[PDB]
Amino acid sequence: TAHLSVVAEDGSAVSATSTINLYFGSKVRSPVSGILFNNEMDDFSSPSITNEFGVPPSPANFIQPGKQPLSSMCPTIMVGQDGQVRMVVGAAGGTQITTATALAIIYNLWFGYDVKRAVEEPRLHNQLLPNVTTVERNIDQAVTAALETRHHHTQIASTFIAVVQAIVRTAGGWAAASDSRKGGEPAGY
Amino acid sequence: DNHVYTRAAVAADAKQCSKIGRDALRDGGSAVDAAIAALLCVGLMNAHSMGIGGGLFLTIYNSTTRKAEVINAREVAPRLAFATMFNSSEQSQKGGLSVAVPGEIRGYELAHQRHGRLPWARLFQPSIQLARQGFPVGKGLAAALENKRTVIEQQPVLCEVFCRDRKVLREGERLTLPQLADTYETLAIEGAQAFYNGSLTAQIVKDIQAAGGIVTAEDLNNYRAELIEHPLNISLGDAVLYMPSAPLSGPVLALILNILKGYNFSRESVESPEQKGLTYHRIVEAFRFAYAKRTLLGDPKFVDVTEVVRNMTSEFFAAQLRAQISDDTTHPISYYKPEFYT
Ligand SMILES: *[C@@H]1O[C@H](CO)[C@@H](O)[C@H](O)[C@H]1NC(C)=O
Ligand SMILES: *[C@@H]1O[C@H](CO)[C@@H](O)[C@H](O)[C@H]1NC(C)=O
Ligand SMILES: *[C@@H]1O[C@H](CO)[C@@H](O)[C@H](O)[C@H]1NC(C)=O
Ligand SMILES: *[C@@H]1O[C@H](CO)[C@@H](O)[C@H](O)[C@H]1NC(C)=O
Ligand SMILES: *[C@@H]1O[C@H](CO)[C@@H](O)[C@H](O)[C@H]1NC(C)=O
Ligand SMILES: *[C@@H]1O[C@H](CO)[C@@H](O)[C@H](O)[C@H]1NC(C)=O
Ligand SMILES: N[C@@H](CCC(=O)O)C(=O)O
Ligand SMILES: [Cl-]
Ligand SMILES: [Cl-]
Ligand code: NA
Structure with a gap:
């Protein structure tokens, strides 16, 4: 998955999230065209596959011909009451996409973190099943303590949680940030 | 630069x-x-x-x-x-x-x-x-x-x-x-x-x-x-948020944010360890309540998600879920009422 955010000079905007699903998709590359094919069929639920311990299938997300599989993707554009874009945001990184997108919005909109900080700020994730709270390596450990004393079992993500690209309107114009977890950098004028 | x-x-x-x-x-x-x-x-x-x-x-x-x-x-x-x-x-x-x-x-x-x-x-x-x-x-x-x-x-x-x-x-x-x-x-x-x-x-x-x-x-x-x-939208303060409905996860995002918006988070929510720890606890619980409802989602051309999505984007419903968030503890899976059928 990759997320990209754009704001043009006229104030129009695009939030685009694209994916071939797992790393290198199906692992099928065409020797002639070079196209690397998705494994998006894996995003369906299957009745005979035991996905996770104690997690049943979701019948709403079973394979039918012509059906699109459920996705965690959520490319978002926030617009102010005056019609001007306020934030362009989304994420990559599997089931953590939605939680990470929520966190980036919370961080900027409510906690007052500037866009770069909103992107770089440590994240955490819980998706109910499985039943564990994952936190990034550099999270404020007072947060970890607050969670554990409230009976969350936490564990630390061996790499990182998601990748966020974002743009936010400021008095100085359009502030952009790409996530250092993957190494991107924005550009503009 | x-x-x-x-x-x-x-x-x-x-x-x-x-x-x-x-x-x-x-x-x-x-x-x-x-x-x-x-x-x-x-x-x-x-x-x-x-x-x-x-x-x-x-x-x-x-x-x-x-x-x-x-x-x-x-x-x-x-x-x-x-x-x-x-x-x-x-x-x-x-x-x-x-x-x-x-x-x-x-x-x-x-x-x-x-x-x-x-x-x-x-x-x-x-x-x-x-x-x-x-x-x-x-x-x-x-x-x-x-x-x-x-x-x-x-x-x-x-x-x-x-x-x-x-x-x-x-x-x-x-x-x-x-x-x-x-x-x-x-x-x-x-x-x-x-x-x-x-x-x-x-x-x-x-x-x-x-x-x-x-x-x-x-x-x-x-x-x-x-x-x-x-597209899906929700109102957040003086803003509107546009995001995709099913088969993407806009409804999950919407529910997370509508749950949390009734806590009126601000800079103060993270200024001390006491407020910060509680704030992050409330975030995780909102994640859990929102993921509970996610298992009913699918391609809306093949599955009727009209009411599920209606709930997941309703502030009232989100308020019902927020009132079940305990400030002192997380809960077992069943507490959040995950559903696999309507
Ligand atoms: C927005 O739509 C109007 C008319 O529908 C068009 O003139 C304008 O070019 C559009 N902007 C973009 C960025 O497509
Ligand atoms: C292209 O178009 C028509 C149907 O749209 C079909 O009859 C024809 O065989 C197609 N050709 C290729 C190369 O896919
Ligand atoms: C899985 O089992 C079903 C039912 O026997 C069969 O139709 C299908 O072809 C099998 N698929 C694979 C990939 O083994
Ligand atoms: C939000 O979506 C609802 C239902 O489709 C509708 O009331 C409204 O037009 C939308 N709001 C905006 C700002 O587009
Ligand atoms: C939607 O929410 C209400 C509670 O506010 C509940 O009675 C109803 O069962 C829910 N509908 C669906 C389709 O899940
Ligand atoms: C899930 O984690 C919570 C943390 O307290 C715990 O209460 C619960 O027993 C765990 N297992 C289930 C099935 O909910
Ligand atoms: N294919 C998944 C995302 C996979 C990933 O980011 O690793 C989805 O659309 O939700
Ligand atoms: Cl990305
Ligand atoms: Cl190539
Ligand atoms: Na930046």
């Missing part, structure tokens, strides 16, 4: 692709032109993540009409697919049978028909060069190559481009994508039809089937990107 820009901005996950997007804007492109040009480049530099073999969604806001739209160009199950076609995760994750019908290029075409200002071919030009000339492998791709070292090294058609002397490329080493360069060139000149009903089509079907897949020419001919004029 600082990444605050007076006029326009592109935030991609590779520097050169953000730049390519930015140049398109400079040369008179719309935000859509820039997004397509940048996406084409990301498909090269982060080929593990996305590309013309996959699918996407675009949320687009027009500053003039003050309207938002969504373009759905996500992959679909092929016409020969069925509910019980897979019996292990390995079957659904590897090989041609794991492949759904790619929508990427029809999505770029629809967006471009609606919002493009630059010529189609111009959007591909810088990525054709890049693929043909080569580029140093970035951090993100390098870690992805390391992660799948084994499968890549043992697969000669992937190692062809993703190795140097039989071993996966590392950060700094040169990656060239000479076949994709030709493919991008054909796309630029013959348009989207080359992929779906044109000079690339039969080779696509052949590659997918040779690897055990079931995609046919008919699937490609029939794929359509979909314009959604009324």
Whole structure:
């Protein structure tokens, strides 16, 4: 998955999230065209596959011909009451996409973190099943303590949680940030 | 340098692709032109993540009409697919049978028909060069190559481009994508039809089937990107948030944020350890309540999600869930009432 955010000079905007699903998709590359094919069929639920311990299938997300599989993707554009874009945001990184997108919005909109900080700020994730709270390596450990004393079992993500690209309107114009977890950098004028 | 820009901005996950997007804007492109040009480049530099073999969604806001739209160009199950076609995760994750019908290029075409200002071919030009000339492998791709070292090294058609002397490329080493360069060139000149009903089509079907897949020419001919004029929105303060409904996770996002909005988070919510710890606790619980309802979601053309989605975007419902969040404890799974049937 990759997320990209754009704001043009006229104030129009695009939030685009694209994916071939797992790393290198199906692992099928065409020797002639070079196209690397998705494994998006894996995003369906299957009745005979035991996905996770104690997690049943979701019948709403079973394979039918012509059906699109459920996705965690959520490319978002926030617009102010005056019609001007306020934030362009989304994420990559599997089931953590939605939680990470929520966190980036919370961080900027409510906690007052500037866009770069909103992107770089440590994240955490819980998706109910499985039943564990994952936190990034550099999270404020007072947060970890607050969670554990409230009976969350936490564990630390061996790499990182998601990748966020974002743009936010400021008095100085359009502030952009790409996530250092993957190494991107924005550009503009 | 600082990444605050007076006029326009592109935030991609590779520097050169953000730049390519930015140049398109400079040369008179719309935000859509820039997004397509940048996406084409990301498909090269982060080929593990996305590309013309996959699918996407675009949320687009027009500053003039003050309207938002969504373009759905996500992959679909092929016409020969069925509910019980897979019996292990390995079957659904590897090989041609794991492949759904790619929508990427029809999505770029629809967006471009609606919002493009630059010529189609111009959007591909810088990525054709890049693929043909080569580029140093970035951090993100390098870690992805390391992660799948084994499968890549043992697969000669992937190692062809993703190795140097039989071993996966590392950060700094040169990656060239000479076949994709030709493919991008054909796309630029013959348009989207080359992929779906044109000079690339039969080779696509052949590659997918040779690897055990079931995609046919008919699937490609029939794929359509979909314009959604009324995306999901929620109201947050004086703002509106536009995001895609099912089969994407806008409704999950909506529910998380509507749960949390009744706590009136501010700078104070994170100023002391006491407030901060409680705040992050409340976030996790909102995540759990929202993921509970997620298991009822699916493609709305195949499954009736009208009321589920209605609830997931309702502030009242979110308030009902917030009132069940205990400030002193998390709860067992059943507490959140995950549902697998209506
Ligand atoms: C899985 O089992 C079903 C039912 O026997 C069968 O139709 C299908 O072809 C099998 N698929 C694979 C990939 O083994
Ligand atoms: C917004 O729509 C109007 C008319 O519908 C059009 O003139 C304008 O170019 C559009 N903006 C973009 C960025 O497509
Ligand atoms: C292209 O178009 C039509 C159906 O749209 C079909 O008859 C024809 O065989 C297709 N050709 C290819 C190469 O897919
Ligand atoms: C939000 O969506 C609802 C239902 O489709 C509708 O009341 C309204 O027009 C939307 N709001 C905006 C600002 O587009
Ligand atoms: C929606 O929410 C209400 C509670 O506010 C509940 O009675 C109803 O069952 C829910 N509907 C669906 C379709 O889940
Ligand atoms: C889930 O984690 C919570 C943490 O307290 C615990 O209460 C519960 O027993 C765990 N297991 C289930 C099945 O909910
Ligand atoms: N294919 C998944 C995302 C996979 C990933 O980011 O690793 C989705 O659309 O939700
Ligand atoms: Cl990304
Ligand atoms: Cl190639
Ligand atoms: Na930045």
